Design a protein around this ligand. Structure first.
Ligand SMILES: [Cl-]
Ligand SMILES: [Cl-]
Ligand SMILES: [Cl-]
Ligand SMILES: [Cl-]
Ligand SMILES: [Cl-]
Ligand SMILES: [Cl-]
Ligand SMILES: [Cl-]
Ligand SMILES: [Cl-]
Ligand SMILES: [Cl-]
Ligand SMILES: [Cl-]
Ligand SMILES: [Cl-]
Ligand SMILES: [Cl-]
Ligand SMILES: [Mn+2]
Ligand SMILES: [Mn+2]
Ligand SMILES: [Mn+2]
Ligand SMILES: [Mn+2]
Lengths: 444, 416, 416, 444
């Protein structure tokens, strides 16, 4: 109220839509009976009440967009497209603004044009956006003696006990922030921001304001000459596919994910309409756990993070559980090994999975296995490319944590660096620098 | 929190000098039909909305203005329709899908009848406020003024004006607009679906047999376009714009954003276009002054007491730069009066050299379906006699079948 | 030279072995209706034509075959029309422009009626030869057999068979095809022109009033497509293919070229498609054998003495690889006989699992306009009863107005 | 006949179409009363008879194509497109074959894609084709003691007196060969030959089989990466403007040009429908002569060759006679100075014409002022670019004599060279090499 600088917004208790089909709910119930790690500790009655609100709200995504994403990921799996996945390590309600969202959309589009030129194939753009509000925590108790911050969907960043309590009213706040962010992403991707014309000045600014600019000048000129040639051949914006940026987040809070399930076909299926695609993290990918089982039940394309403890046998079990119908690009295996280990640990995993006859996307996450040194991030992607080139497999994409702000979170870049509510992000300049360097890797 | 059924929000760059001066001067004018909640509580809720992602963006409003200019010039037709009042309880995917289908279906019929493009503007993503003649309703309760102000429930507590409804209205608007954007790029927007929609309408309508001939023509037209090699891939993605009555000045001012004709302007990014209603169009009032300060295309409702002189004053205040499409004059006269009252208004305004859209609202001056049809018929008669453009309709959607029926009847009017 | 009214031409890589064997074997078969000029003079004229630029190229013939496959499958309609006999004297820009306009106009009417694409094939750029029942005509002169063979002038000298007419025919064909290519990429090919063409037809036709309703529907269809945002820039450039009766084997063999389904084939590049007439379709004759050796889509005319057994033999010899669209069977039965004679032919051929185009030629078995219309009506009746595809018409263009009238009447048949 | 290995083809005497309008014929009569240099010496009665045949034949070109060419040449004049004009020095009836025409169409398309990439603007393609059958001659008597060969429209190449007699039956033979060539050009430009996809293998073959290949490898790779980027952005052939190749020749034989006049508008105008655009040569550009006057009367865009004797005053008189209505790109001034003289002689001409306020196309003909050394040809274009860069004017295009045959006619190129019925042409390899070098000039 007036005394503590907060407003209370009532949660309208509105009539339920018809329930999801009994057969699909029976399958979901069996999956959710499995143990789930890293779940909020709020009471069941509060969770149930807040899920019931979300069961009737307009979805963030629609099934036809998830079917189109699946078709494009099939192309990535077959080595005919590249996947660019990036955005905030953790979205916050406080930072869920037009300038921040516009910055992350600009960064993805800029990176995607550079990678398209380097790869000579289409780039599928998947933002970490409109739902990246939950994170696991290793530490029971943080450095201030407080219950850990678990992301805005669970508790508050503010270092005080009351803010840190798990409150499932944050499930509804998360949905409101997701739907508002996704509304703006849809608006921006049909706006003049999505014009290839703008890339000239973006890359020019990058080359001029980067100390290592002169290093990227030649490729930036090539891209510009490329764009001008397209235009000279008579290609106007009106003649190009509208920019498509898909939404993703880690499927961590199963209360949120289950309330955002909706029915679509030509057999009836559950779609998670909180996002287009979701991944399962290092700490929640237990083969007999609720997260993998939930991923088995939904129609969405899914990802699994593979850390340095991954065996080829377990990677193949993920393939059998999550791609039982052999649908290329339904499953993405996300390497996060560390730059010193990817060259040793990834090859035997890739061989054994390739031998299943299943076609996964191989995606590099060079952040989570490495504050963070830019050079080690670049070297893990380099190693990932080396592993695939050696094995004749497709280095399918990258998963990076970035922002279109000139923040100071990752060491290195041309800036010789000596606001995240989580891990360090590459700033606007470092994320573009990485795109230039991965474009060279795709070319070499 | 959850145990209080509340979301808790902690509340803890300047406008160009001239835009601050003009916005302050507009808001200091008398405002009719405003909620009676405390200024301090309203300021807190506006502070939440100051930083949220907008419902719309300026490039869409600039594009709408270009498409409305085409309407004003007699080269396109405006279809504006949707719920009389959106409610939080009906702000669901099936309801929004139904309203999007109805508009798309009505638009294809009108396009065929007019032989020109139809600009689609939904009453959606913020039609949460209404004026009321009487502050006490027939049950003796403070009047329900829409979910942005109070609750429909017939109890005094629910009818208290609640400024938290500014934020609930935005959340509900954002969620609706997200889905409208998703649906208009989805298979729902394919012209192929019109065959089955019109087939169902003709087969299940009492007066179906009456519309079978025009429905068959449209089908043969769609098939011809396909036969000439036109696939969905080769057509403009469907654009449905968002509109609502700009009534609650707390909400509209909170949703103002600055954007660059080179010079920074204020856009109301709660919608693409907004209108000013019959009870809030006081010429020296805050609503008309607020409409003068925003870049959006605007509408003004004109009822039976409208004079030609005052219609001209609206046009000169709201279209001062002579930009076709910037202003829509919405006739709502009643079927018995539109033929007598509208001609002298159209003549005086046409004489200024300003080019407004003339739009027919056949609801609010009349509900018997036949009287609604007759007001639009009268509107068309007025323009045909003056050689002016009957530019569009504004409807409240009449169930699904009656709204489709009206589209078929107005398509015949555009063909006459 | 000029003083002799002559152009003087000095006459001073092998086919794949199997194509040489097959072409030689086809040409050694008996050939009906051939010119009677000396072999040595014919060889000299063929030697000129061996090196000239082709009238057509293989990529166009491959594309036509794909579009005809669509006809065979019931997803497109074939319109084939033009002069009964092209003449050098009428091979002028105004005449060619008139024939191109008539085909484009008939095609848009048929497209609207069929609700599917229309493949346009002109009798043009080589329709310079005709067979004759009698070698001596009613004046007692050797029969005129078309400008590729002799002269129309009623004197014995003009009627002598003149092999120099092979080269004159090619020059006239090349010049016509050049202009057809120019006109189909010109403003003449814009759908916008159909409004005025149909308006003129309805206003100047005796039975105009009869076609006004369909002409208005087509106009409303065209305007709808434009209103949906479809400009000429967004449509397939108009494609008019070249055809003629493959009659003079000297001409067709000289215009053979080799092109690569991977393997080298012979294409007749005097045209896109050629047909074999009623007087030259001897099953063991050179014409049918020549049609078997070329890659082009081909047609065979079927008159009233056709049996189902022989129609099947044509299909098995000319479509040996089961390629839909490769073969067109052209019914020319007469309006009194098509309903009786065509059904058992269609049943036997459909049973083979080969997919031919069924095309109606309502001219050569009948000229009273009403009998021409009735043969096409009968053709449609036969296919409707069998559930087979009435795939197209082949007309001789009947003046301009009657050919348009027939398009309107067949459009109604496709709609029934 | 059978004894001398020739066939006589009768010229059908067919009915006349209506005459052209009396007012336009009265203007044409005044122009043609002026002296005409280098005209065939055949009798008036034979010329009249043969013109009358051509007055009723289908045109080679139509007015809407000439209106579209004029719009594109306006873009060249304004520095927003580049003009590529090339083909045979002299076409022959004997060589007017599918392989020869396909070779010249391939060469123009290949050169145009390279120049488009280098210029970063559209390239207008104008072939010397379907009518380049007449040439002037300086020499009354050639080296064999014979009346000179004047091109296939006038007399025969064969070194015998009878072949060398001027025979206006060759006007009709020229028309037949023009219409057949133009028919094939129209067919080829809508065929798979016109696909940008084919440029990869064309440039690859050029780089691999050129001894100076390694010199062009980098630009050939850039173009390939450019094309692949276009395709990766979703641009298919179906989404590009059909290739347009216009027809041109020197308007030399006024009997042919006048018989090919047709009427079109919105004031009635004479169009020369033997071609899209015609130029007037060095030896026939007399300011008070019939050729310039004929060019004044026709609607077609026109060119005038400017040799080393050209003064700025005379260049400005051409501008006033041929561009009286100030229509950009209606007039092309074609520099043919020689590599040693263009840097000295062109600047004062460009200055004086620029000062008229008229916008001509400046086109370089580096052949006719220089057998021919490749290096001197390259150096004249270099000098032309230098003159415009210095003056801030638009180096608008090139006019080159080329063939898609591996002939040995020009000295130099990567081939270190130590079939034309006239001047030496650049072979397939030299013409492509020149396009690569002019692309660098447009880039520098
Ligand atoms: Cl917070
Ligand atoms: Cl399953
Ligand atoms: Cl490591
Ligand atoms: Cl205030
Ligand atoms: Cl203003
Ligand atoms: Cl009334
Ligand atoms: Cl022989
Ligand atoms: Cl075969
Ligand atoms: Cl009969
Ligand atoms: Cl010769
Ligand atoms: Cl003039
Ligand atoms: Cl020199
Ligand atoms: Mn992270
Ligand atoms: Mn209402
Ligand atoms: Mn006939
Ligand atoms: Mn030359």
């Amino acid at each position: 109220g007036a005394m503590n600088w907060t407003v209370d917004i009532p949660i309208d208790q509105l009539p339920s839509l018809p329930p999801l089909p009994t057969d699909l709910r029976t399958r979901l119930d069996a999956a959710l009976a499995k143990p789930a790690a890293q779940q909020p500790t709020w009471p069941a009655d509060q969770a149930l009440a807040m899920r019931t609100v979300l069961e009737s709200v307009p979805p963030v995504t629609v099934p036809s967009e998830i079917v189109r994403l699946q078709e494009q990921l099939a192309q990535v799996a077959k080595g005919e497209a590249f996947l660019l996945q990036g955005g905030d390590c953790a979205e916050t309600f406080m930072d869920n603004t037009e300038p921040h969202i516009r910055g992350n959309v600009r960064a993805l589009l800029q990176m995607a044009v550079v990678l398209t030129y380097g790869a000579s194939m289409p780039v599928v753009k998947v933002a970490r956006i409109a739902g990246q509000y939950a994170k696991p925590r290793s530490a029971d108790i943080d450095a201030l003696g407080l219950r850990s911050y678990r992301g805005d969907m669970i508790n508050g960043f503010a270092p005080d006990a009351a803010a840190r309590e798990h409150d499932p009213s944050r499930l509804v706040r998360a949905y409101a922030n997701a739907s508002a962010a996704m509304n703006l992403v849809r608006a921006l991707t049909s706006s003049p921001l999505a014009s290839l014309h703008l890339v000239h000045d973006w890359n020019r600014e990058f080359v001029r304001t980067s100390p290592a600019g002169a290093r990227y000048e030649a490729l930036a000129t090539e891209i510009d000459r490329g764009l001008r040639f397209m235009s000279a051949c008579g290609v106007a914006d009106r003649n190009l596919q509208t920019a498509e940026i898909y939404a993703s987040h880690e499927a961590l809070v199963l209360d949120y994910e289950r309330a955002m399930l909706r029915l679509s076909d030509g057999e009836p299926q559950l779609f998670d309409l909180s996002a287009h695609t979701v991944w399962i993290g290092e700490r929640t990918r237990q083969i007999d756990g609720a997260h993998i089982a939930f991923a088995q039940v939904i129609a969405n394309p899914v990802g699994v993070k593979l850390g340095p403890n991954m065996t080829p046998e377990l990677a193949v079990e993920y393939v059998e559980r999550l791609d039982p119908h052999n649908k290329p690009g339904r499953l993405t295996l996300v390497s996060r090994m560390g730059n010193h280990k990817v060259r040793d640990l990834l090859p035997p995993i890739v061989e054994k999975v390739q031998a299943t006859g299943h076609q996964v996307i191989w995606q590099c996450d060079p952040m989570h296995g490495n504050t963070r040194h830019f050079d080690r991030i670049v070297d893990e992607v380099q190693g990932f490319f080396e592993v695939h080139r050696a094995l004749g497999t497709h280095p399918g994409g990258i998963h990076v944590e970035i922002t279109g702000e000139n923040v100071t979170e990752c060491l290195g870049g041309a800036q010789d660096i000596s606001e995240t509510a989580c891990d360090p992000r590459l700033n606007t300049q470092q994320s573009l620098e990485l795109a230039f360097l991965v474009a060279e890797m795709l070319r070499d």
